[PDB]
């Protein structure tokens, strides 16, 4: 799905601005 | 997971935070 | 720099890495 | 690591698809 | 659905980019 | 607001002029 | 300076995502 | 408006992919 | 064109590459 | 050279904006 | 202002915040 | 071209509208 697809783009990057020097995993 | 709970409706920072490292 | 620039890498790497995804740590 | 890897000078797609996990 | 936070996400990108040295106000 | 006009249409640089200082 | 250009695109995104229903007043 | 958000990931992604080649964008 | 074939389903990094130059 | 791929990538963005319905040729 | 203190310097969240409305 | 006349010095709007198609 690109809803999907477009809204994980944006979540890496509130999760890149959010959780800073800890950083974080991503997996669909 | 993140998608579920956070492309379905608008999550926090706080519960964005959870799925920190 | 280096935060702007990594800002740039996770779109880049979420692109690449597909379905395998990955792990950001600065 | 990847900063020190791709933003001194820039990374190719394969390049970047290294730190994918 | 979360539609809205998206599109306001880029609308905030291209008010920054219009507006240039004048700057913008952002209220929902 | 602007999302309500910007979010269901897509607008002009004329209407994206509007919420400039 | 492009520098900057770019930086303050990153930092109303940022603004975009932290301020929530705050808002925010952008302005060079 | 979906298509429109659609649209600006993709020349970003291309952006990305074609390299030093580039992209040819029509809407 | 790549709207219709990449908007509704994801398209992979090879077919993107098709719309390169 | 990543400032001026980091450029590029804003520069991009900014036609997809500006061009509209005429699109626009990208090249390095 | 916010330039000085986070384009030649990094800024967390909490500090991106204190430019609030 | 566009980086050489836009990456070093802002190009505005209207600057950049002389590289549409
Ligand atoms: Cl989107
Ligand atoms: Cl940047
Ligand atoms: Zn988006
Ligand atoms: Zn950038």
């Known amino acids: ?3 999907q697809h477009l809204c994980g783009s944006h979540l890496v990057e509130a999760l890149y ?5 800890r950083g ?3 997996t669909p | ?3 579920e709970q956070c492309c379905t409706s608008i999550c926090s ?3 964005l935070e ?3 490292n």
Chains 1, 5, 7, 10 share one sequence.
């Open chain 2, 18 to 20: 959870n799925y920190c």
């Open chain 1, 1 to 3: 799905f690109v809803n």
């Open chain 1, 24 to 26: 974080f995993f991503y």
């Open chain 2, 1 to 3: 997971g993140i998608v």
């Open chain 2, 13 to 15: 920072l706080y519960q």
């Open chain 1, 17 to 21: 601005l959010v959780c800073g020097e």
